[PDB]
Amino acid sequence: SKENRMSCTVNVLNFYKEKKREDIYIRYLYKLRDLHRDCENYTEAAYTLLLHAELLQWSDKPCVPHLLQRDSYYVYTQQELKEKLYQEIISYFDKGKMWEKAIKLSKELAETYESKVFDYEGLGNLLKKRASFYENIIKA
Amino acid sequence: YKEKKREDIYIRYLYKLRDLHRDCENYTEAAYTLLLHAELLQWSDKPCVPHLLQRDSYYVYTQQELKEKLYQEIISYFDKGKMWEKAIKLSKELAETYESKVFDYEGLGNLLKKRASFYENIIKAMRPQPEYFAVGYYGQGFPSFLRNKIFIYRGKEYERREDFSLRLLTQFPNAEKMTSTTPPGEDIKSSPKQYMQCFTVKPVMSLPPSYKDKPVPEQILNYYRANEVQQFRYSRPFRKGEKDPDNEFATMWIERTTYTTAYTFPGILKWFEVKQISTEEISPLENAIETMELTNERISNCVQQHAWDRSLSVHPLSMLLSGIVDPAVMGGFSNYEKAFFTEKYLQEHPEDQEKVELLKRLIALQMPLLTEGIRIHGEKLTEQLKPLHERLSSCFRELKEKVEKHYGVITL
Amino acid sequence: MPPPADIVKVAIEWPGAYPKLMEIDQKKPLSAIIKEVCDGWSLANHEYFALQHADSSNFYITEKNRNEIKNGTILRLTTSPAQNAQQLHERIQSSSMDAKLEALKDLASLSRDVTFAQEFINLDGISLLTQMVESGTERYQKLQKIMKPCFGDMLSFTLTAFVELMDHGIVSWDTFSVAFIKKIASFVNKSAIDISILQRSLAILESMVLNSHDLYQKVAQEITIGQLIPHLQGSDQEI
Numbered sequence: 001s002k003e004n005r006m007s008c009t010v011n012v013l014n015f016y017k018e019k020k021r022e023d024i025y026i027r028y029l030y031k032l033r034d035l036h037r038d039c040e041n042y043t044e045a046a047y048t049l050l051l052h053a054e055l056l057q058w059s060d061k062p063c064v065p066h067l068l069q070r071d072s073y074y075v076y077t078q079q080e081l082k083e084k085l086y087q088e089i090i091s092y093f094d095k096g097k098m099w100e101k102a103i104k105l106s107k108e109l110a111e112t113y114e115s116k117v118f119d120y121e122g123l124g125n126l127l128k129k130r131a132s133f134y135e136n137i138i139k140a
Numbered sequence: 141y142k143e144k145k146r147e148d149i150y151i152r153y154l155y156k157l158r159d160l161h162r163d164c165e166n167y168t169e170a171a172y173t174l175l176l177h178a179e180l181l182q183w184s185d186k187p188c189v190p191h192l193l194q195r196d197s198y199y200v201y202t203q204q205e206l207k208e209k210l211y212q213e214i215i216s217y218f219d220k221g222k223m224w225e226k227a228i229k230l231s232k233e234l235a236e237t238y239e240s241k242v243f244d245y246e247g248l249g250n251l252l253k254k255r256a257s258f259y260e261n262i263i264k265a266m267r268p269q270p271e272y273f274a275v276g277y278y279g280q281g282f283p284s285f286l287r288n289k290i291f292i293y294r295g296k297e298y299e300r301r302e303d304f305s306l307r308l309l310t311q312f313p314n315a316e317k318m319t320s321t322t323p324p325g326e327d328i329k330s331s332p333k334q335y336m337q338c339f340t341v342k343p344v345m346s347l348p349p350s351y352k353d354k355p356v357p358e359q360i361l362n363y364y365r366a367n368e369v370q371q372f373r374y375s376r377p378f379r380k381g382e383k384d385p386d387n388e389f390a391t392m393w394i395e396r397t398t399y400t401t402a403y404t405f406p407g408i409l410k411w412f413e414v415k416q417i418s419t420e421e422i423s424p425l426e427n428a429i430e431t432m433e434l435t436n437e438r439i440s441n442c443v444q445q446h447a448w449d450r451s452l453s454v455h456p457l458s459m460l461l462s463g464i465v466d467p468a469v470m471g472g473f474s475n476y477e478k479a480f481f482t483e484k485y486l487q488e489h490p491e492d493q494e495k496v497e498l499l500k501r502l503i504a505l506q507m508p509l510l511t512e513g514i515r516i517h518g519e520k521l522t523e524q525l526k527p528l529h530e531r532l533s534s535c536f537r538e539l540k541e542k543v544e545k546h547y548g549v550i551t552l
Numbered sequence: 553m554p555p556p557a558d559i560v561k562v563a564i565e566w567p568g569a570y571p572k573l574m575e576i577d578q579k580k581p582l583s584a585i586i587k588e589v590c591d592g593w594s595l596a597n598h599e600y601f602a603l604q605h606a607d608s609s610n611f612y613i614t615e616k617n618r619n620e621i622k623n624g625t626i627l628r629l630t631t632s633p634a635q636n637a638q639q640l641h642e643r644i645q646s647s648s649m650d651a652k653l654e655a656l657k658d659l660a661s662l663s664r665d666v667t668f669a670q671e672f673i674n675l676d677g678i679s680l681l682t683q684m685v686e687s688g689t690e691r692y693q694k695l696q697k698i699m700k701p702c703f704g705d706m707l708s709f710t711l712t713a714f715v716e717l718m719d720h721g722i723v724s725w726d727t728f729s730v731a732f733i734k735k736i737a738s739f740v741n742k743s744a745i746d747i748s749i750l751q752r753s754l755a756i757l758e759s760m761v762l763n764s765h766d767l768y769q770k771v772a773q774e775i776t777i778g779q780l781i782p783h784l785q786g787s788d789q790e791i
Contacts, residue, residue: 118357120259127256131249138245266563266571268624298561298624454594522596 002039006032023066026052030069042092046101049092053085058112079116083109090129099133106130148191151177155194157408167221171214172408178210183237204241208234215251222265223406224258225363231255263359268297269366273304274341274374274399274414278318278325279334288329290414292341292372294405301340308336322376322397344371344398355448361441369405371418373398378421389479390488392424425488425495428475432502436509439464443512454520458528461513465532469539476503481547500549507543510536561623565606569593571626582615589629602632611665633671636662641677644684649702660709663716672717678727681714686731689738704746711752718759725763728756730770737774747791750783 016025093102161170218227378393398418559575605611643655
């Protein structure tokens with residue numbers, strides 16, 4: 001089944017995590033989260049997407065074509081890829097009903113703003129999101 | 141009282157001050173007073189003392205309740221004060237105190253979303269830079285603490301030295317515009333009929349560590365060029381001796397004057413006695429060299445802040461280029477050859493020589509900065525800016541040969 | 553004192569973009585300096601802009617009263633008064649009552665100016681105001697059934713703006729019509745009307761009196777003693 005087939009994909013993902021063909025690993029991880037958003041469950045979506053971006057680092061310069069994806073081929077400045085994935089993961093938690101880790105990631109996003117990008121528009125929007133998170137939590 | 145550590149009447153007068161500033165409708169300093177009151181208090185969940193309360197309102201009041209109340213009106217002031225960095229900082233600590241101490245998440249959200257609003261105001265809103273005029277006091281009849289002292293005032297945001305003169309001198313019949321800005325008066329040090337002197341002085345920037353190496357927009361730069369400062373420069377010229385009217389830049393000495401004060405603007409009060417003085421002056425050689433160096437810094441910052449915005453301010457940057465070409469190609473460099481690239485510029489002093497090769501490497505760095513500006517303008521060109529671009533690029537090429545073969549500037 | 557720096561510290565403002573900070577020449581006409589203002593934010597088309605006296609005055613400062621600006625105020629830049637005026641009377645022709653409503657509110661806000669009054673003159677829209685007040689009270693009768701208070705506010709704003717334009721005197725004074733006194737009668741001979749429309753009608757009455765005589769005879773044929781005293785029954789000392 002779709003659940004069973006994604007489970008077996010995870011098992012072969014472990015097979016990678018030894019064999020570490022990290023490129024095809026990440027791509028089949030992508031397929032995994034694709035069928036997952038087909039299944040409308042956000043937990044491992046966010047988790048694995050992070051662990052992909054967790055492999056990434058807050059440095060700017062992109063080096064490894066492994067982590068360079070093949071969607072919209074440009075240099076893929078590492079931190080900006082990270083932050084992208086961060087906002088969609090925040091959206092996952094938005095529809096994921098759980099917000100603690102969302103705030104945990106939000107704070108990193110904000111401090112990265114004030115590290116390099118300085119986009120006070122994004123600062124503000126991320127902070128309205130954090131506020132939303134707090135009233136969600138109290139209103140659960 | 142602070143010296144005599146009588147905290148109680150201390151607080152009394154602090155609140156007198158907040159009312160006094162309110163009636164003066166001054167908000168930054170009122171907030172500042174409110175802080176230095178608050179910073180007595182700590183984040184202990186123990187209502188240790190009621191003595192610190194003003195007798196207006198009290199129930200059990202763990203100190204944190206009072207601290208957060210204080211912060212509420214303080215951030216209100218900093219808002220209406222239209223100055224923000226300290227506000228967002230206070231938001232940082234108020235938010236952490238909420239989240240890990242009282243868990244009042246509605247307040248968390250309220251203050252943090254207001255902090256975001258303040259961020260956007262920082263970017264979107266304009267910050268006028270108040271100018272700083274140095275006011276010496278000389279004459280017999282003053283209040284004792286106003287005698288033979290220099291008070292530099294953060295004047296109004298759009299207020300020029302003459303208008304400040306109006307304030308001080310309509311404030312003072314026996315008005316005197318004693319013009320010799322530099323020297324005091326020994327006669328007047330105990331003579332009545334009080335001597336004033338006033339003149340703008342220029343702030344020493346509040347260089348924030350670790351921000352020099354960043355994509356800092358102009359917003360941060362202005363905010364710190366006009367606030368939380370302590371030192372203020374003031375320059376005057378010297379010209380005596382070798383009287384060549386072509387380019388006097390061997391005896392165009394200038395006399396900058398900076399000062400150091402006990403505490404830091406903006407404070408609980410919008411002026412201060414001077415607590416230390418920087419008396420200084422330099423020979424025109426090093427002076428003009430530093431002018432060029434700071435100009436290189438100017439356009440370097442221009443291109444870096446410009447290296448990330450497409451529809452950034454175009455025309456004034458092009459005007460900086462125009463000043464680089466139209467007045468500076470002939471006049472701004474005629475000194476470079478005559479006043480510098482001549483033998484007299486060494487018979488001035490055999491002591492140092494990195495002078496002229498230093499300015500040569502500076503102009504060598506200068507030209508690629510203009511390549512950068514030229515091409516980014518090539519993105520910025522308007523219907524009329526192509527011919528201006530082409531003419532300045534023609535001048536740019538001829539200056540290539542002027543620096544490389546005429547100046548002898550080393551290519552690298 | 554009479555020479556300052558010809559450039560003077562008034563922060564300049566523009567919609568959307570930042571209010572810019574610089575000093576502005578008092579020795580350079582308000583077209584080159586307008587051009588530089590536009591190009592400051594990297595903008596163009598300076599020739600269709602107007603410097604508003606950005607307080608509640610909303611006036612459009614010319615080079616005569618350019619000298620009256622002092623340092624450090626707000627100066628918003630909306631399009632040239634000719635552009636605003638043509639647009640405004642264009643929205644006045646708009647059959648949609650809402651576009652006329654907004655244009656008319658702008659007109660009431662702006663007619664206090666004398667310069668804007670002059671451009672309004674040179675676009676000849678005063679004639680349009682004339683014929684529209686003198687016809688629309690009898691033309692829209694079907695929807696007037698509902699828009700009696702709507703036309704109340706429209707007449708009010710129209711006449712406030714009209715008297716603000718009219719009082720300056722440079723305007724001629726047969727700019728009324730027989731239909732002018734007709735709408736006067738539709739104010740003063742029917743039931744109670746809006747106070748402000750009545751105020752401005754009476755104001756035009758007295759100005760017309762100031763102008764000439766046979767005009768006063770004209771209004772005299774629509775003068776009854778027992779209509780003007782019901783305006784004493786209006787206990788407002790102003791009316």
